[PDB]
Subunit: 339 residues, 4 copies
Amino acid sequence: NDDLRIKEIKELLPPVALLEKFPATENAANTVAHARKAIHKILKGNDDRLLVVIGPCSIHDPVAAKEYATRLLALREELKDELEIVMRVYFEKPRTTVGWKGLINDPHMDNSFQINDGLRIARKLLLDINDSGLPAAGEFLDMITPQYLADLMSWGAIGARTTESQVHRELASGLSCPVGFKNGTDGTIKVAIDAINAAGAPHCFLSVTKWGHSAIVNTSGNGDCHIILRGGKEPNYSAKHVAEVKEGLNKAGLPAQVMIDFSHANSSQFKKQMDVCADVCQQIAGGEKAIIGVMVESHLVEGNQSLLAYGKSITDACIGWEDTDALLRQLANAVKARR
Amino acid sequence: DDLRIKEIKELLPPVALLEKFPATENAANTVAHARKAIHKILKGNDDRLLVVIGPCSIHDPVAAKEYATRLLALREELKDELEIVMRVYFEKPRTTVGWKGLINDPHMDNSFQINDGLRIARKLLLDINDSGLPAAGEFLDMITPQYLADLMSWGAIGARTTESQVHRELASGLSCPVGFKNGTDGTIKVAIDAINAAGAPHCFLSVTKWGHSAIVNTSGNGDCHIILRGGKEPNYSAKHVAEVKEGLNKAGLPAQVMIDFSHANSSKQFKKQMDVCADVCQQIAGGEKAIIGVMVESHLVEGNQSLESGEPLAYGKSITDACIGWEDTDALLRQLANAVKARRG
Amino acid sequence: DDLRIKEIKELLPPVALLEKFPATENAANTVAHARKAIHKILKGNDDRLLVVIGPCSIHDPVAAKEYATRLLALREELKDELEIVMRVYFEKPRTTVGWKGLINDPHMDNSFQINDGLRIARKLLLDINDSGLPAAGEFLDMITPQYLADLMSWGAIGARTTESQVHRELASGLSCPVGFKNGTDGTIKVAIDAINAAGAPHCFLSVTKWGHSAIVNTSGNGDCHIILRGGKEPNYSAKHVAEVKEGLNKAGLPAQVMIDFSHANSSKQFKKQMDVCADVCQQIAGGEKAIIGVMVESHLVEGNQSLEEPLAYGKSITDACIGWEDTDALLRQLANAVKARR
Amino acid sequence: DLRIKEIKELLPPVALLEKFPATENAANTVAHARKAIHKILKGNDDRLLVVIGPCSIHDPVAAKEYATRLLALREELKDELEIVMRVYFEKPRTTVGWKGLINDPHMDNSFQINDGLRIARKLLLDINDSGLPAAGEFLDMITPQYLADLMSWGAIGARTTESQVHRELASGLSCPVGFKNGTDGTIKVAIDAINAAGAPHCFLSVTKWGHSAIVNTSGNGDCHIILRGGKEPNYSAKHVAEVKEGLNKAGLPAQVMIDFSHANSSKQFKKQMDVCADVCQQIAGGEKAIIGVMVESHLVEGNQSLEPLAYGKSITDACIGWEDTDALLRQLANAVKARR
Ligand SMILES: NC(=O)N/N=C(\C(=O)O)C(F)(F)F
Ligand SMILES: NC(=O)N/N=C(\C(=O)O)C(F)(F)F
Ligand SMILES: NC(=O)N/N=C(\C(=O)O)C(F)(F)F
Ligand SMILES: NC(=O)N/N=C(\C(=O)O)C(F)(F)F
Ligand SMILES: [Mn+2]
Ligand SMILES: [Mn+2]
Ligand SMILES: [Mn+2]
Ligand SMILES: [Mn+2]
């Protein structure tokens, strides 16, 4: 009574294959370690600096990403006294129903699903970027792919559609990096507050080891978890909403910190991310220590592409690079003000 | 990695449980007949009502089997009006933390004796199917289905994972029909998207019956439907059914629904499923053909009790959501059967 | 790669056959007690003879169980003289090619339903042990022992594999005592060489109960010994035992032998096993204390038959065996020869 | 488990194959070599096949020093000798001992077998990428999946010619395989294994993924005998003649590889030159049945026991030095010119 609806089953490389081929260098290992220890500090109250997770919405061209990482690394070491810069290196995309799920799931973007390649491309891109000294951040959607990338990851996000799901709260509970939970698409805070609490508890569940086998896995629990404001049916980045989310966090016994995502439902329109910036910057300038981080969808070329132009996102519309240089400067100064 | 991964333990692969507990001939009949029976209802070629009914969670095989024996007697007595499937749920999703079900923690004490769990779960599923009674479950975990899916005639994606891509993927290659719940706030769109997503073929990483990860390709599942489970308010009434029916048609899908009488549709008041039932029976007996199914939370004894006390538990009583007891369950099933008869006619 | 490999098919992992067919308590006691009794015979502290006796190969579980029932009766009746251990050999090695046993081709038709074979083999092994009769097998390949070795109270390494590093490694990790047969030349050297190696600890690649390759480290097996099985000519005579007693001291291991009444020692004539028995008995009845064991090819029905129709019940389709009547007489002769040595 | 002490984990072949893929180059080294040994084996190349190199490999630097020297001779004697280097990673013992690089890469009994494979696959990949074919003993059942794609010719140990699992292995190997006569210096055991290895088999093995599987093989037609001596050597044109008839009687081509070392050598490494003279006389005398030759050679003559180690010197069987090696191969190349 098995596998009427399973078409084909193809061999998949275990993580140790991707680990052996592409070990972490000394630089990669250290970039990761330090950014993780930093975001801990910024999260336990002991750094006025602002974490800036920024980069494209999805990666499809490893050359464009390599160029972007080049540029962003300049301002990372430039603004290091106010900002903690981390690059958006997003290989998995959650679809409302149907479509391209990203570089790992379909690297050639032709529904060829040469996943084994996608795992090579992604791991090498992630390793090279960490070797620059640029730390990386991704969304953890699949339960199996993290074993190939998690050691190259300084920070992670759970997507708005899976924030309530127990299997992702289990995953978060065992990641060695800090984790952020987006509010519900229904705008509200509670499912992300439950998720933080769930992901801080020890969990025991079924996962796949570095060998590609199934096993029983115990996790310690992840205390480095925080909310990510992303908007609802209307945006929720305003100074009213922050204070709302602070009380809500204090009620639920959790640190009153927040990361505001300039994009998605918070900009309804990529240009609007810039208006969120001033609004949010006014708050950070005007003594608002509750904002511990920010999320921006930025690429080389602004705008959006569909299914082929260079350095332009094929998923969400991003701000181009000129705008990106401006935005990172407003942030480091809002931080300068607060300090 | 493994900074926050405390400990790793060996897990029996699916083929081990399958070899230890193969479907008997009758068990496999039960699974095969129930799936086609449901598929026929979903296609509109049967005026009968699918009824998924039983404990919120299984924590004691002894009372699970006592309950299955009583349900099977009614399933045979009423089979011209109802297609009775017992809730046999081994996975429980929590708002934050708590007991995640019999598989994850069979002895109910954070021993996490998962191999035992799979052994107890599959033997129980086997015993119930061999007896003639089909089983339903929530598909919550990405790895447990390989151990149990061939003894499952129907599954549910829970309200907290309906929007989850991996859950929509899992349903697209499941052998059985699958119901998708509206969102914990009462949102119909997530579930309709879920049905469309699950109807489509997918390609994604999963774990095989050999316990090894692999690239799997699915054909899509056509036997998917919405479940109305309440939001802020209940959404079982005529008014809401009409909205869901219209929104299915507007999305190009058959306008048919299963209504859960429990959870938010009862405001978590177990006796209120008797009132959801009265209203829903009247809709059916009055001519509503879109109600193809209902779900009820039922046990041997009504109410519930809490593991977390530390006392030894009463027999045959839920340790999760409160359920109606057996006497109410028998009456509910007869009303449902009677309403289906009246709809005929 | 794999220009000469045509197909790869899936293989049930050991843990799946251990879960379908777990040892019963009875079966596990059979293996525990038997393993222990043999180890005590092998170090001197028991004068009984160890008798490994049964079919050349199992091709039919039904006749095998009838054989076990009859053999079990005699195990009890002679237990003060004989430690009776049923030959349950699945895997068979061949000089050219041919049916490699029940595990490899249970349906005896070149279908290679190995999963079925392992299911049948473990089921049969489990039943025989569960009834109280301990079993002995040959270990030929490296992957199958995980599926069966927990129901094995004694083992043998093939005459064609006694010089094998891979086979001496395996013997070092086994929980049962293990005999090594002399070379097809009939020379004894490689046997002792193999008893020394198996006694040492080893580290080698092997498969786990999970069907995965892993690195394994073995303690080493000190319950090993030679099996005399002839060469160019039979080598069971008292003069031959003398030469091998002498060589076993020259190497510093206990001067003991198991004598195989079959194969080269009977010139491949199943009836001649009765003549080997008479000669060995007079050695035992002669005070020869260093003969610790015997191996007999025995079945319900003497002789053999070829594969082509239904077959004869209880009659070997590999090597010719003695039938039950001679089996009963030959075991009584061996018992009385034990009584005489005391 | 009573006699099992520990179960460490093990990279699956596909991990080694992925960190250390075959270069375009190394892929051609093996493709041509394999096809060359095949053409020589189908009686179709006046040339001899010398399998020459250390008894065992225990130092990848000393070893690729050796290799780069022997690549030159391969380039020079290219018209008389198909030269193949002896890259042996696994050693069968007569009881206990050091099983070679893979089992114990640091010779300290720590059994870092995961490093052993990494080291070994790196070495082979290099020697092959430079242009030089490789050869080894196939003793273990699990190791072949890490290394075989860089093996041009393989040998089955003399203490394993009679073992079913090794005949089974050879039936699936993609390279040609030689079978040593047994230690009893007798030839039937090898003749059987040649027939066995040519047939399809079906048996349990392990995949590139580290999983137990059921495997069917096609059979191996590129197999031959290796004369290795017994209680006395067997390289004589008399012994050769005896094997030729016995092999014709068996339906196999009368063809022979002569191993100059081990029992043929009286196990005295310097005698390999005596055997080399006498074997050359046969190749000179038009003898077409000697298709290949095996010699144990290293940078420096002799052997040593297990305190650090003399560079260049075998840790197992004593071998001849490099200059004796150079003269031996030109000795061999000349006799092929005479035959031609
Ligand atoms: N971080 C991302 O780009 N993801 N986008 C989202 C997701 O989680 O799907 C969103 F915030 F819109 F919900
Ligand atoms: N059947 C169950 O107990 N599940 N309950 C639910 C779930 O799907 O979690 C609910 F309906 F509340 F959404
Ligand atoms: N014990 C067996 O049945 N097999 N024994 C032999 C074999 O390898 O056939 C032997 F060589 F001893 F005759
Ligand atoms: N071929 C080698 O270098 N090792 N030695 C042998 C082998 O077993 O192959 C030998 F011939 F000595 F037995
Ligand atoms: Mn986006
Ligand atoms: Mn419930
Ligand atoms: Mn026999
Ligand atoms: Mn040597």
